[PDB]
C-alpha cells in the first residue's frame, strides 16, 4: 500500500518519469554510484560527541511494549520525540528479556567456528633467528567445495535464500544437485536474515585466490595464521591439527489469463500454458514439456551429414 | 570474447567456424563479434532441421534413436563451391530456378527454399531488408530473436511448436548468460544491417587541427608523422649525437677524505626565545592531593578546591614587562579573574561553567576591537599608502643556552607514574613471551619519565579547549588547566596549572584562528634570564612556605600572562602524542631486530638484562660519557616529544640533508672509498634551512659535536 502510493507520485514529476521510462534493469546499478562523494568528517570526534547525549541511538516503535521506561535505579530508558533510545536500554536487555533457541547459529557460522576448532587443539614448536627469501605463488584464502564451480555456487544461493527470482536457466534445466536438497532442509525455519545468510554462504562456497608472499606451506590452512608464523628474522613452526522442464513460447498473452508466480507453478497441469513473471521484470509464456532434449551423442550424429 | 564461444559450443559447431573465417580471410583475435553471429547462425541453421523423417506414404513424423528421408540438406557447413553445385544439381532435377543468394535449407515436403536469420535488433525492420533483397522468386524466409519473438513470411511456420519453443529458448538463455558477464553491449552495438563491424572512432574536425599542431617542428600532417613512425630503423643515431657533443657535459667524481668535511655555519643576531603553548620546566602544581575513590566531578570545582588549600596571597606588581602593550591590563585581567572566581556564593543555583564578563582589559588582551574592515577595490582605488602584504624577511638570531638545559630536565625520572596501561590475554607461544618481556621492560624503563607528564598535560589541555570552542561560541568562558597521576604509595591525585581565557570562536573551516590568554604559576625569577621571556609579562602575586629540610622558609610565586592563538587543527595535533611513545618503542625493537640478525640468534636478554654494556650518549669537557639502556630509552621518547612540540619546515629540510651527509660519512667509515659530485650544495641547502628555529639550531650544534669526533 505505501510503496505503490510512493510509486505513484514519482511518475507525476517530468524529470523522474524520463529515468522510469528510459532505463532498463539491466542498468540500475549504474545509476545506483550517483549518490555523493564527501562524508569524512572526523568520525571519531563524532562518534565521542554523540556518546555524551542521552538517546543517541534509534528503535522501532515496538520497544515501548518490551522495555520499561524507567530502572530500579529511576534512569529513563527511552523517550518520545523510530524514536529514541539510549545503551542503557541494550543493556537492559542483555540483562533481561525474552530468550530464544540458537540451535542454527551454528550451521550458518561454521566457516568461522571451524577456525577456533583448528587454533585449540593445535600444538607450538621453537621459533629460529636466521635470514630467508620468500617468493610468491598463488595461494587460496578460500578453498571453497569440490565438485562445485562458480557458475552453480550463485545459483545455489540464489534457490536457496530467494526462490522466487531465478530465471530462464536453472528453470529450464532438468536435474537437482544435492547440496541444494539439504540446505533447503536444514534451514527451514531459520529467521536470521536473507542477506547475511547468503553471504555466509558465498564465503562458505566460493573459491577465491590471491598473490601473498608466503616462505611456508602453501595450503588455505597456513594462510589464515600467516601473521604468526612469519617475521622479518625469524620463523615459528605450528601445526594446525585436525524445477521441471519448460521453454519460453515468447512474451505475454492477453488470452490466457493473469500472471502468477513461480512457487505457483506446482499445481499446474499436464501441458496447459500459462504466464510466470521470471528473474527481475521479464514475463514470458511457457509450458511443460513432452520429450528428453538431452546433450548425448544425438549432437556428434551431424557429423554424418558431413564428409561423404 | 574467445573463452565464452569455446566454453558456450560444442566443438563440432566451433570447428565449422574457423574454416568459414579462413576462407572469407578475417582474423579471431582482432574480431569477435563476427565469430559469435557465425556460431549462433550455424547452431540455429543445424536445431532448425533436425528429428525431422518424412514417410514413404508422405505424412511427417518424429522419431529419435528405416531408410527414410531425412527431409532436409544441410548447406551452411559446405564451401561455396559445392554449396553451388549441389543447389545446382537440386534445381535441375527438380525444375527450380536459380534465386540469387545461397539459399540456407530446403525441404522436400513443400520443394521450396528457406533462409534463417537471427537478428539482435527487433524483428520488423529486419524482415524488410530480406523482403527487398529477395523477391520475385519463391523463397520462404524466417526470422528468430533474441528475446522470444518471431516472424515468416504468410504466417505459415512450418514447424510444430516444441521444436520453435527449444529454439526460442535456447535463444534467451544463451543472451541472458551473455549479458550477465558484461559483453551484450557491444555485440548488440555490432550490426550495421547485414554485417558486423567491431568498432568505430574518427577524429573529423576541431581535434584534426589541435591534432596537427602537437608535432614536432619539422611536421604539418599526423598522417606524415605516423608514417615516419612506421618506417624507422636505427642506423647510428644515439652515437653521432653523442660524438658531435661537448666535453662541457661531465659528471667527474671527487674522493670524500677524512679532511673533507667542514663544520656547518650557524647565523648570528639576537637570541631565541620561548614560544611554547605552555611552560615546561618552570612550572609547579597546587594538589587536591587525594579525592575520594568515588569522586567524579566537573573540573571548574575540582579547580576551586584546589585553590583553597592555599594561603599567602599578597598585593600583585610587576617585576618585569611585556615592552609591547599596557601591562595594568594584565593586573585588571587577574584581580577580576579572583574576583569572579570568589563571587559565586552571590547565585540561587550553581552554575556548570563560569563566562567571565566582556570588560576593557579583556577587550583589549583577545583583540576584539582590532578588526580591519573589508571593502571593494573599486571605491578605495585613489587612497594613499596602500601595501601588498606582510612580505617580510624573517629574522635572523642566534642559539643560547636554555633549550639544552630544558632537554636535559626532560629525560630526567620523577615520583609519580603518569601512565597506566590495559592488559591482554594470556601468553602461549614463545614469541609471544619474547615481546611480553620486551614490551615489560619498556614500559618499566620509561614509565616514570617527566615526557610522560607533558604528553598528558597536552592531551588534556587541547581537548578541554576544542570542547568549550565547539560548545560555547559567544562567550568569555574561563578553562582551568588539571592533569592527573597516582602516588607512590597508591594514592589518586588532581593538579592544578594555571587558567586560560577564550575569547570568540566562529570556526567554519580548519584554518580559522581563535585567540586566548593564559596564565602560569611559577618559581622561577624572570629576572635571571630575561631575554628568555620576550613574550611574557611577569607578575608578582604571592609567598611560598618550603617544608624541604629542617626548619621553614619562604620563597616568592610568580605569574607569567601572555596572548596567543593557535588553531583547529594544531588541537587535534595536541591530542594525539601517545604515537610518541608507540615510535620509541619502534625504534628500540629495530635496533634489536637488526643484530638479531647477524648474530643468528634472540639479542633481546643482552640489551637489557646485561649491565656491564655501555652507550655513549652525552658530552662534556673531558669527553664522551657513557649510560645504561633506561637513559637512552628516556632520551628517545624525549627526543619524539619535542619534536612533536616543535614542528616547523626547516626541521624537515634539516632531517634529510643531514641523513644524506650522515649515510655519506658512514660508508667513509666503513672502508667503501665513497665519493661526491657536488658537497658544496649539500651544504648550501643545509644552511639556507637554518633560519630561526631553536630547536633546528641546537639539532646542528649537535651534529656538528658528532663530526669532530667521529673523524678523530
Redesign the interface.
Known sequence: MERIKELRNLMSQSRTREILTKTTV?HMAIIKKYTSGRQEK?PSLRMK?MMAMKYPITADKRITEMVPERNEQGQTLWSKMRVMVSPLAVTWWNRNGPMTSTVHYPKVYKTYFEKVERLKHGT?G??H???QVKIRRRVDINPGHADLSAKEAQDVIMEVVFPNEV???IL?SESQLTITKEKKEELQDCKISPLMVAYMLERELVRKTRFLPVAGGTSSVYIEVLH?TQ????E?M?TPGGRRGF?????EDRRYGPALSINELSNLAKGEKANVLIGQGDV?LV?K???D?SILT???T??K??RM | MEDFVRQCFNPMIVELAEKAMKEYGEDLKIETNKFAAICTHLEVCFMYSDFHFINEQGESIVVELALLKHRFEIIEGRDRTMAWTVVNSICNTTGAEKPKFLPDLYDYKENRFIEIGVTRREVHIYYLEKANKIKSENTHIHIFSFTGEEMATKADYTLDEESRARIKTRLFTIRQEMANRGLWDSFRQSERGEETIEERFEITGTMRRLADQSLPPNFSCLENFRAYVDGFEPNGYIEGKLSQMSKEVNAKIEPFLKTTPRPIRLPDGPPCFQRSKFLLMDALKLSIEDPSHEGEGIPLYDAIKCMRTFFGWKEPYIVKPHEKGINPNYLLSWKQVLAELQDIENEEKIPRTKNMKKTSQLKWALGENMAPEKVDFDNCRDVSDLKQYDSDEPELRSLSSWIQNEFNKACELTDSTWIELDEIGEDVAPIEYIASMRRNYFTAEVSHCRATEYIMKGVYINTALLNASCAAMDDFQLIPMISKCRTKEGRRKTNLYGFIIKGRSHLRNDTDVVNFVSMEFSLTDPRLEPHKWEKYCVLEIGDMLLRSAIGQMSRPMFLYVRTNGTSKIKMKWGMEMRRCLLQSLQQIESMIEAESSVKEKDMTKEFFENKSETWPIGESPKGVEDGSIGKVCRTLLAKSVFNSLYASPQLEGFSAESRKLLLVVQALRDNLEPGTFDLEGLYEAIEECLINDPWVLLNASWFNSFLTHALR
Open positions: 539491466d572526523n560527541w607450538f621453537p621459533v633467528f636466521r635470514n530465471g530462464a536457466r529450464t604468526l617475521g622479518t628474522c625469524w615459528q605450528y521453454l519460453i513460447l515468447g512474451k514470458v509450458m514439456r513432452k520429450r532434449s544425438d549432437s556428434q551431424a557429423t551429414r558431413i
